[PDB]
User: Which sequence fits this backbone?
């Protein structure tokens, strides 16, 4: 699971899209999404 403030990823990101428990994948930009 992607860590806090890590890039969970947006469109085109096939890596760890699911953030760790306690963090939410928030889409900031189309391709850039971060675990807040």
Assistant:
């Amino acid at each position: 699971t992607q860590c806090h403030y890590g890039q969970c990823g947006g469109i085109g990101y096939s890596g760890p899209t699911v953030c760790a428990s306690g963090t939410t994948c928030q889409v900031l930009n189309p391709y850039y999404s971060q675990c807040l």
User: Anything to note?
Assistant: The two ends are 13 Å apart (CA to CA). DSSP finds no helices and two strands in the chain. The chain has one domain: 1-36. Strands lie at 25-27, 33-35.
